Point group: D2
Amino acid sequence: AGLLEGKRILVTGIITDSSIAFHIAKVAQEAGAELVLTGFDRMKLIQRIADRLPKPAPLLELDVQNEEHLASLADRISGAIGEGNKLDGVVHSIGFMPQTGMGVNPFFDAPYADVAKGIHISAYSYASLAKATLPIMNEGGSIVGMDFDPTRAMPAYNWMTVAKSALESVNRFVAREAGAAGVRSNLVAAGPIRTLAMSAIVGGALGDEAGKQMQLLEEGWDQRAPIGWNMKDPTPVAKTVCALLSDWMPATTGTIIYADGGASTQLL
Amino acid sequence: AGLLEGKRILVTGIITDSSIAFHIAKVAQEAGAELVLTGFDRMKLIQRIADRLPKPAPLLELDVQNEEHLASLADRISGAIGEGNKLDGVVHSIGFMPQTGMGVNPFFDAPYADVAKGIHISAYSYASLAKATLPIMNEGGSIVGMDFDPTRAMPAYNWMTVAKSALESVNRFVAREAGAAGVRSNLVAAGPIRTLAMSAIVGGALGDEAGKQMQLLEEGWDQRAPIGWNMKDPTPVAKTVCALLSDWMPATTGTIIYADGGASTQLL
Amino acid sequence: AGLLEGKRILVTGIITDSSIAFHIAKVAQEAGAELVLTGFDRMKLIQRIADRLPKPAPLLELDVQNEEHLASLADRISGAIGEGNKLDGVVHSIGFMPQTGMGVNPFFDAPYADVAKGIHISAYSYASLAKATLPIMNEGGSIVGMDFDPTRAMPAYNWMTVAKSALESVNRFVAREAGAAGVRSNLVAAGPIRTLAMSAIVGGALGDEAGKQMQLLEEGWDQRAPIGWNMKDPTPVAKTVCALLSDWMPATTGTIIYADGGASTQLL
Amino acid sequence: AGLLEGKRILVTGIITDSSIAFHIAKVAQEAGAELVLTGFDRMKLIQRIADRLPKPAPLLELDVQNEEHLASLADRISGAIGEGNKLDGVVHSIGFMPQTGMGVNPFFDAPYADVAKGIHISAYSYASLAKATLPIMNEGGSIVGMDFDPTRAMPAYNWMTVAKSALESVNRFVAREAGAAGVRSNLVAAGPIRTLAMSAIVGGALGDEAGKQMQLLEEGWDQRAPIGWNMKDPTPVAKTVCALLSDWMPATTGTIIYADGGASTQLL
Ligand SMILES: NC(=O)c1ccc[n+]([C@@H]2O[C@H](COP(=O)([O-])OP(=O)(O)OC[C@H]3O[C@@H](n4cnc5c(N)ncnc54)[C@H](O)[C@@H]3O)[C@@H](O)[C@H]2O)c1
Ligand SMILES: NC(=O)c1ccc[n+]([C@@H]2O[C@H](COP(=O)([O-])OP(=O)(O)OC[C@H]3O[C@@H](n4cnc5c(N)ncnc54)[C@H](O)[C@@H]3O)[C@@H](O)[C@H]2O)c1
Ligand SMILES: NC(=O)c1ccc[n+]([C@@H]2O[C@H](COP(=O)([O-])OP(=O)(O)OC[C@H]3O[C@@H](n4cnc5c(N)ncnc54)[C@H](O)[C@@H]3O)[C@@H](O)[C@H]2O)c1
Ligand SMILES: NC(=O)c1ccc[n+]([C@@H]2O[C@H](COP(=O)([O-])OP(=O)(O)OC[C@H]3O[C@@H](n4cnc5c(N)ncnc54)[C@H](O)[C@@H]3O)[C@@H](O)[C@H]2O)c1
Ligand SMILES: CC1(C)CCC(Cc2cc(O)c(-c3ccccc3)c(=O)[nH]2)CC1
Ligand SMILES: CC1(C)CCC(Cc2cc(O)c(-c3ccccc3)c(=O)[nH]2)CC1
Ligand SMILES: CC1(C)CCC(Cc2cc(O)c(-c3ccccc3)c(=O)[nH]2)CC1
Ligand SMILES: CC1(C)CCC(Cc2cc(O)c(-c3ccccc3)c(=O)[nH]2)CC1
Ligand SMILES: [Cl-]
Ligand SMILES: [Cl-]
Ligand SMILES: [Cl-]
Ligand SMILES: [Cl-]
Ligand code: NA
Ligand code: NA
Ligand code: NA
Ligand code: NA
């Protein structure tokens, strides 16, 4: 009798247990969903993390830059869930930008090969993921991507901002294409979440002045947010993704839902 | 064991059973909610309508232009549900614009007294409703208003578009004020819904060319919408409102969720 | 041989020489324009101010809440400039919100009569000004309003933010109606400008903490702005308004041009 | 005594005399500007087109995908205008997407190498162009890019929409970086312009149904536009770019100005 009871959902993007996708996975299972997970590169590390989830789930290798991985993905998912079953949700929780395109490096100093890799992984793969999973998706199903509001420029985020702007545009076209199968596509735009990478920045991995500066951008996010914002708590985000994966927003597609405490809606 | 299990929700705006709020009410009860209804003016007609809902609920009179009605609302809800029980959600489903400000009358020809009445009922009252209900709202509660995407000008809607632009602005401030009580505020932007008033326009009550033109605007909304749009089916909208009333979007506030088939995200 | 050479332009909203419209007027005359000025209430104070402009211009009384003033405006401009000469531009530089709706008063505590007066003067009057002036406007003419970016809620501005959200909506409809006469309509969204009223706030007329807070909001606007922002310098805003009055943006209408140093495009 | 009198302006993007950059060049020279042109690939064809301009101008080869071309660009511009002179404007009028990413090809069927080439040329090069010309730009100077409103998905434009969404994001970061030199950056979002490529589509180069369909998207653009839209007339666009290159919008940066007849501001 759970929100996602009986739903079969692909969840990409787990690498640690601070991963947003880890908590999407956890909440989805606690809501009654059966999952199929995917991981990139460190497959053994990903299996160990995934065993900490409430329930076991099949894990599949997927490098979104790998054409062969994508071509076979739907075949491998179907064997996972059964030749006759189909997915009801797909969670895109994948991002990447080399340190030349995001960090202390000047914005003009990022070579395009690096930016191009970052946009491939972070934006284009939303479309290629949808292309690879839509043939085995049910009608009324739901594809959800993870966003960080790129409406305005900001320090450090740099070319990852540009990738997110691209991802928002891709989402609207995925919505169009998925719509013919009866499948919705949306993004969830989250506030900052303290992953292990994000702590490293507080710890100084890009400079000590930055750790303070970001620690104060986070305090400013909490100040702007009318209901506050706790960056150590990804659970609100995970619940929002499950909201989109459920049957309760059945006419919403091509859009961005903000799970950020309202901070985007307040000037200061 | 439902989405709004045990939640208490004020629902405003029922006048017919084609009313959007009627279907919000019906879906919310089927999802486990217990309601307090409000109605305006034709109180006996509204009780007749309310008797057709899945479950009984108290009906309170509320003219949002009436300061006395508003001042006493929290006390009268309290007497209905008990001065120890609190509200979990509030649904604003109220709009009005005189015929001078919306329809076939030239845009420049609407007198301000008419526009001001329209904006009072349609936008300001989202703030005065929230002010009158927040004292008896629980933490984590949810306030929801009905919107019609006014980002772009359009024929006929005229000053109601301006009232909706005003309402979107009010919602962000309500979000700020409600946030201190741990209460979220959002709007749902619905596509066209065939109410009795809307059928009158197709039936010609504003010119025969407009009924055709209207009938073709609806077919183009269904064409733009990647997953389609059925204007005779308010249920998708009602479900989305309940999605926002639930506990599954706990970090979302001050925003607009589009329940329009995705039509606003597609140019053509 | 200047930007507005030979153009005739109504300029509203002069009350002091710190008024934005005073600098619009001064720049427009230096660019070659010939003006008709309007003023409200303190007519003798405004003539004293108008005498300080580079060139003489007629002053007409205009209370935008006064239907008689508006009905006669085109005739009175005609008598000023000649019933065979037409206007080339109209500058709306008018705003007002009672202290209950903007400042230190709680957002929920503004009575609607006060909000309605504020929206009448600040937003509706952009439509009624345009309706009263278009009969005597030339093809290719330009109507320009002053805006303050209300996309996001913010402290103090409160119901004036809502009036500005309303004004942006009105501008798109004015654009539609003016378009049949070959007349453009746009808004300029300016950053904070130090008027006499604005200095009063820094000087403490709404609390000492607010003056500091205000003084720091201005320093953060200058920090966000990639090219900086000098709130003691209205000249950039006046130039932008003239840019829109000229013939160099002949396909731009219904939009908002940001004269804010770029601060609205940067998150921090 | 022209709008751009004495200004030195780099203009990229001429390939035919229907090129938007051709008309930007023409209007700029007619406004009193001295130019430096750049061309890609068919250098001899570009020289012949450029000789039809009102005044001669130095032409320089520039392939924005060519690191050596970019590194030397400022050296070659300086030799062109004089070792001691500097640019006052830079016009980015460059776009490209392979036929896999824009046209009749399904959206999901575009390989990333093609999308990546299109985003390199169409979006990233706005940043690399600015990086290569800013060292020789004066304070108060202006960089202008050409945009096509990608806020909503649309048929055919497909991955070029995504590139434009990326370009809008890049523009805001270029505004940030250029701001430290005192240089503004903006985009002009134009309505459809009948280039030779665009006529080919009307002529059937991608299918006859499309030629009618686009011919009717253009008639719909003219209908939405409150002041109309003439796609055979790029002069309004060119004038708008010159508006941004002038001294008259000196506090505008990071933004998009719409030269589209107002069509983006109207729903229908
Ligand atoms: N952390 C935040 O504050 C925050 C805020 C808003 C949005 N987001 C977004 O949420 C998503 C998840 O990021 P996160 O913060 O959980 O960090 P994360 O490092 O835990 O997750 C990113 C994931 O991307 C995967 N990935 C990278 N390259 C890949 C490839 N070639 N193929 C397949 N997978 C690949 C990694 O394996 C990893 O699991 C990203 O899209 C990110 O942009 C994060
Ligand atoms: N019908 C649509 O196509 C559509 C689309 C999008 C949004 N909406 C919005 O949905 C909401 C509900 O409208 P609807 O379409 O269900 O029509 P409706 O006529 O059924 O509901 C509007 C309600 O507002 C009430 N109301 C009017 N004046 C009032 C006052 N002074 N005090 C209190 N209540 C008052 C009426 O009694 C009525 O119940 C409105 O806000 C409307 O703008 C409607
Ligand atoms: N000052 C800023 O920081 C700032 C920033 C952005 C936008 N703006 C806008 O610029 C415009 C000009 O304001 P300002 O800052 O120059 O202040 P101001 O006080 O100098 O100008 C406002 C004008 O509105 C006039 N006005 C008020 N009620 C009127 C009525 N009933 N009829 C006619 N005119 C009436 C006043 O006489 C005054 O001349 C306003 O629309 C304001 O909201 C101001
Ligand atoms: N034509 C329209 O309807 C329209 C509408 C809005 C925006 N725009 C934009 O206006 C700009 C100009 O396009 P146009 O319509 O004038 O067409 P066009 O073909 O005349 O111009 C595009 C230019 O890009 C250049 N280019 C391509 N690859 C290049 C590279 N590697 N290095 C350098 N230059 C390269 C070509 O040489 C050409 O001059 C583009 O950015 C386009 O997206 C066009
Ligand atoms: C300094 C800065 C603006 C603070 C907020 C964070 C939020 C954030 C977004 C984001 O997309 C990511 C991310 C990017 C790529 C791969 C994995 C994760 C992140 O770590 N953090 C981005 C950086
Ligand atoms: C011609 C037009 C654009 C067709 C679509 C409709 C949608 C719509 C919105 C709306 O707010 C209402 C509405 C307004 C006031 C009170 C009750 C309902 C409506 O009836 N219809 C609005 C008019
Ligand atoms: C605290 C706050 C955000 C600082 C910036 C200012 C900018 C501003 C806008 C504005 O519309 C006005 C204004 C309003 C009504 C009449 C005349 C002028 C203003 O004074 N100041 C608005 C208030
Ligand atoms: C069918 C469609 C939406 C009609 C409108 C046009 C407008 C348009 C934009 C545009 O960026 C271009 C373009 C793209 C790449 C290189 C050169 C030019 C174009 O030709 N035409 C784009 C295609
Ligand atoms: Cl590969
Ligand atoms: Cl009353
Ligand atoms: Cl009156
Ligand atoms: Cl190279
Ligand atoms: Na806060
Ligand atoms: Na459709
Ligand atoms: Na700055
Ligand atoms: Na038209």
